[PDB]
Structure 1
Amino acid sequence: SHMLDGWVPWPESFARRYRAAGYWEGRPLDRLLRERAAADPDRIALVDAAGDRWTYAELDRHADRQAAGLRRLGIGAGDRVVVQLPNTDAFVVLFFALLRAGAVPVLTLPAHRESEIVHVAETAGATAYVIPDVLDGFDHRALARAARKAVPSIEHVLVAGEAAEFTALADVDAAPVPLAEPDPGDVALLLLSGGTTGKPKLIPRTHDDYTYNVRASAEVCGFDSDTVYLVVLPTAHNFALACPGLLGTLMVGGTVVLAPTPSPEDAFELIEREKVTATAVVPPVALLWLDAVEWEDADLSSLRLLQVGGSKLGAEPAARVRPALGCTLQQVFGMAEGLLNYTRLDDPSDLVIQTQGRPLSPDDEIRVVDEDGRDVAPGETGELLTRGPYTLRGYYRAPEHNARTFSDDGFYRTGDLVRVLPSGHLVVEGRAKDQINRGGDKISAEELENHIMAHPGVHDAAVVGMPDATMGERTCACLVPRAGRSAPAQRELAAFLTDRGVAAYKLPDRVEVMDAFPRTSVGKTDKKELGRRIAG
């Protein structure tokens, strides 16, 4: 019996093995804060960008008070709550408050707009939505009004800021009350993945598997009480939340420092001010920092570990991390779906430079298969399939996609092309899935194509990635105009998509108009050949 329907538990035989091996320790996710605050109440747990500071005991207490306030609003056992918050202390307190109230956080990113927010709120049956007031020039309260009109289940809107007609998140506060613990085998939170289909996909992560994700990651990355971790990616990004991220920092009793942006202006100042020892970035930010040290005078000497993931960091900039930034590079090839690959901190520099790591868990199982589904010869390139103690067995409430995406024996088809080396380290070679990786941001081609085809000048759309030296990939929208109509150019299409509620990282970089798309002999649109026609 599980508190949530719509997800796919592990087979009992696997669950027994993972419990027996010590992976699944049977503790709710919120206990990592409860346990740390009991052992080290007066250690500094959290610093925000302004320099305000909270101890473990203060964070634990505030989470209890906000959990009690949430229950007063009717937000509790099993309710899904969409969270869209910046890198501020509000998110950290609310994350644990929701867990302790029994609610299931549905984590979205500040960039997400009406299309993504409405879909995930509709899918999850969310009863509440948590937003800032204004962030990076955008009034999320307007977006909350749109989401409520489209999703009747949303009863409460909690605002980190000026609440307007809604509820101020700060007022969600009450005297702590005894709350029952959740079953550790139940879903603790839902993550978002760009995915490959027409709608974003939600990833259920259980208390046991996410705690293991956090704990094992902290071990591999040498996180402990003298770690000062800078949250540069969004707090809701799996990489910065749990790999080991802020949760791993709190679990071991280090200090979490929240960066408001990844710019050197903000990040370098915080690294010097707070003596940051570890952080995690995507390659475009790594390149920016590697450049910026040549004209910034910040003292970054405290930095010991720079994790780089989300897309493949090239060997040439990888080699520059130690000379330029004075720290150890760790390549991380991970996914919200589960499987994490890490270079080890004392790997030879050759493997840190040239590979994307090896799996976190001894019981991470990996297969590399050809087009016919057969295992490749050792060292050959094929598609990575994986199964393990923190990799999902299905997306949330997506049975049709699950039937296509997981093999019969439960292997998740990642859509990544990889080689496995004799040491077990992986090299990322490309992608099989129809999803563009734009500076770390994942763009489902099918979803974007459906949005674009809603434009009155478009009959058909095919979204193709184009290589980019610093972004990895950019997005080209190939358009067949509607009969007797002119297709839009890039700027009009961008405006149409933004008004439609499409996140800004999905706006096509380039538009190419054409009377027809190349097709295979099936005949699906041949995006291999579209890439060539784009290039001439």
Structure 2
Amino acid sequence: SHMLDGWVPWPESFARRYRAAGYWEGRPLDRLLRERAAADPDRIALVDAAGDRWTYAELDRHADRQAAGLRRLGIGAGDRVVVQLPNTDAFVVLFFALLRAGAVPVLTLPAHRESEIVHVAETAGATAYVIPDVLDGFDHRALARAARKAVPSIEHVLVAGEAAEFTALADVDAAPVPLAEPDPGDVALLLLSGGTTGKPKLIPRTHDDYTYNVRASAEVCGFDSDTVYLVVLPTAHNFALACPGLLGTLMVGGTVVLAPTPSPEDAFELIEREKVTATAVVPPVALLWLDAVEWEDADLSSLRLLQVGGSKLGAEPAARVRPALGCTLQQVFGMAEGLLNYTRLDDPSDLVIQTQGRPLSPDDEIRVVDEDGRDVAPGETGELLTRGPYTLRGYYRAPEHNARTFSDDGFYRTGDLVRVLPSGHLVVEGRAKDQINRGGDKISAEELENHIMAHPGVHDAAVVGMPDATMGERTCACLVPRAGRSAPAQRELAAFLTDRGVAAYKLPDRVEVMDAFPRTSVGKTDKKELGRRIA
């Protein structure tokens, strides 16, 4: 019996291998803090952007108090809680308090709006929603009111700030209570995938596979008690949470330092002030920092490791990382679904510059296949399929999408196009999935098309990616105007999408209007040819 239904557990044969190999160590996710705080209670665990800092024993205690307060509210074993918080200490405490209460965090980003939040809350049948009050000029409590009208299961709303009619997250606090450990083979959290279908999809990560993700990534990244990790991406991003992210920093006893934004203004000062040794960024932020050192005077010398992932860093800026930033580059080809590829920190610089890494686990299995599903010859380009000790066997409550996306023997189809080199390192060559990668931000084309076509002037919509030198891809919305009406232009369509509740990173960069969409045989919209007609 598993505490949650709607997910697809590993076959018992694989489970026994991964336990025998020491990958699945049988420990709840919250135990990495409990254990580090018992051994190093007085070490500084967490620093925020203001300079406020907390020990391991203070983090562990506060998480115990907030787990107790959550239970006084009825948020307990197996309930799903949508979490949408900025890079604050409030997120870190709530993450471990939800785990210790038995609740399942459903992690969303600050940029997500009503469309994403309502669907994610509905799919998970979430019983609570955790928000800030106002962030980047948006009042998230308005969003929480709209979410509660569409999703009746939401009983509580916890606000990191002025809670209005809702519950203040700071008041969720009570004397610690003995709370039962969860089964380590159960789902610990739900991640939001970037998406390839009309509706976002949630990824269950179990305690055993996510601990191993964190533990093995910290080993390969040299994370130790002397690591000062700067959280530049959102705390809810798998990359900054667990690869090794903040959980890996806390697992080994380093210091987590929270950045409010990735701008040099904020990031470079925290690196100088806190003596940050490691961080992780997307390539657009990499290029910015690579530029900004020529007019910023911050001392960044404590930097030892810059991870760059989410999209492919080019070889020319990759080669600039050591001269400009004085640190080692690690390319990270990962996914919230599982498989992580890392360059090794002592790889020859050729491989750190030209490749996106090699798999994290000895039991990560890699297949590269052609259109006919057939394995390619060595060193040819095909679609990557993967199976392993921390890669999901199925999305959460998405059986139709599961039947298209995983092979009969359990291989997850990444939708990425790759080459495997003789050393085992991968080179990302492109994408088979219909998903735009806008500076690391993933845009499901089908989701956005369903949004655009709901506009009264749009009949059909085909969303196509465009190369961009600094963003990697931008978004073009190709529109067939509704019969005898005028399709909207770029600013009006963007305004319609915002009020419909679409995250701002999914707003099209460009609008193209045409009479019909190029079609292949079988009658599907040819977006390879649109990529040409719109050029």
TM-score normalised per structure 1: 1.00
Counterpart Cα distance in 1 of 2:330 and 2:487: 45
- Deviation at residue 340 of structure 1 after TM alignment: 0.1
Deviations along 1:213-265, whole A, 9 cap, x unmatched?
A: 00000000000000000000000000000000000000000000000000000
- Supply the RMSD in Å over aligned alpha carbons: 0.2
Deviations along 1:371-413, whole A, 9 cap, x unmatched?
A: 0000000000000000000000000000000000000000000
- Deviation at residue 433 of structure 1 after TM alignment: 0.3
Deviations along 1:442-496, whole A, 9 cap, x unmatched?
A: 0000000000000000000000000000000000000000000000000000000
Q: Which residue of 2 aligns with 1:77?
A: 77
- Deviation at residue 32 of structure 1 after TM alignment: 0.1
- Deviation at residue 440 of structure 1 after TM alignment: 0.1
- Deviation at residue 503 of structure 1 after TM alignment: 0.2
Counterpart Cα distance in 2 of 1:164 and 1:452: 33
Deviations along 1:132-176, whole A, 9 cap, x unmatched?
A: 000000000000000000000000000000000000000000000
**Superposition pairs of residues 91-110 of structure 1, within 5 angstroms:** 91-110=91-110
- Deviation at residue 12 of structure 1 after TM alignment: 0.0
SS of the residue corresponding to residue 105 of structure 2 reads: strand
SS of the residue corresponding to residue 146 of structure 1 reads: helix
- Deviation at residue 48 of structure 1 after TM alignment: 0.1
SS of the residue corresponding to residue 74 of structure 1 reads: coil
Deviations along 1:75-120, whole A, 9 cap, x unmatched?
A: 0000000000000000000000000000000000000000000000
Deviations along 1:409-441, whole A, 9 cap, x unmatched?
A: 000000000000000000000000000000000
SS of the residue corresponding to residue 230 of structure 1 reads: strand
Counterpart Cα distance in 2 of 1:19 and 1:376: 32
- Deviation at residue 195 of structure 1 after TM alignment: 1.2
* Structure 1: runs of 5 or more not aligned: none
Counterpart Cα distance in 2 of 1:533 and 1:512: 10
Q: Which residue of 2 aligns with 1:340?
A: 340
SS of the residue corresponding to residue 377 of structure 1 reads: coil
- Deviation at residue 528 of structure 1 after TM alignment: 0.3
Structure 1 runs of 4+ off > 2 angstroms? none
Counterpart Cα distance in 2 of 1:207 and 1:463: 37
SS of the residue corresponding to residue 209 of structure 2 reads: helix
Counterpart Cα distance in 1 of 2:121 and 2:163: 20
Q: Which residue of 2 aligns with 1:530?
A: 530
* Structure 2: runs of 5 or more not aligned: none
Counterpart Cα distance in 2 of 1:156 and 1:62: 20
Aligned pairs, how many? 535
Q: Which residue of 1 aligns with 2:60?
A: 60
SS of the residue corresponding to residue 378 of structure 1 reads: coil
Counterpart Cα distance in 2 of 1:31 and 1:464: 44
Counterpart Cα distance in 2 of 1:160 and 1:288: 31
SS of the residue corresponding to residue 400 of structure 1 reads: helix
Counterpart Cα distance in 2 of 1:422 and 1:271: 37
Deviations along 1:316-359, whole A, 9 cap, x unmatched?
A: 00000000000000000000000000000000000000000000
- Deviation at residue 194 of structure 1 after TM alignment: 1.7
- Deviation at residue 210 of structure 1 after TM alignment: 0.0
Q: Which residue of 1 aligns with 2:386?
A: 386
Deviations along 1:12-31, whole A, 9 cap, x unmatched?
A: 00000000000000000000
SS of the residue corresponding to residue 262 of structure 2 reads: coil
**Superposition pairs of residues 1-20 of structure 1, within 5 angstroms:** 1-20=1-20
Deviations along 1:253-293, whole A, 9 cap, x unmatched?
A: 00000000000000000000000000000000000000000
Counterpart Cα distance in 1 of 2:300 and 2:2: 47
TM-score normalised per structure 2: 1.00
Counterpart Cα distance in 2 of 1:344 and 1:160: 39
- Deviation at residue 511 of structure 1 after TM alignment: 0.1
SS of the residue corresponding to residue 340 of structure 1 reads: strand
SS of the residue corresponding to residue 522 of structure 1 reads: helix
Deviations along 1:6-47, whole A, 9 cap, x unmatched?
A: 000000000000000000000000000000000000000000
Q: Which residue of 1 aligns with 2:497?
A: 497
- Deviation at residue 508 of structure 1 after TM alignment: 0.1
Percent identity among equivalent residues? 100
SS of the residue corresponding to residue 75 of structure 1 reads: coil
SS of the residue corresponding to residue 383 of structure 1 reads: strand
Q: Which residue of 1 aligns with 2:452?
A: 452
SS of the residue corresponding to residue 200 of structure 1 reads: coil
Counterpart Cα distance in 2 of 1:109 and 1:255: 23
Q: Which residue of 1 aligns with 2:150?
A: 150
Counterpart Cα distance in 1 of 2:302 and 2:519: 54
Q: Which residue of 2 aligns with 1:183?
A: 183
Q: Which residue of 2 aligns with 1:461?
A: 461
- Deviation at residue 131 of structure 1 after TM alignment: 0.1
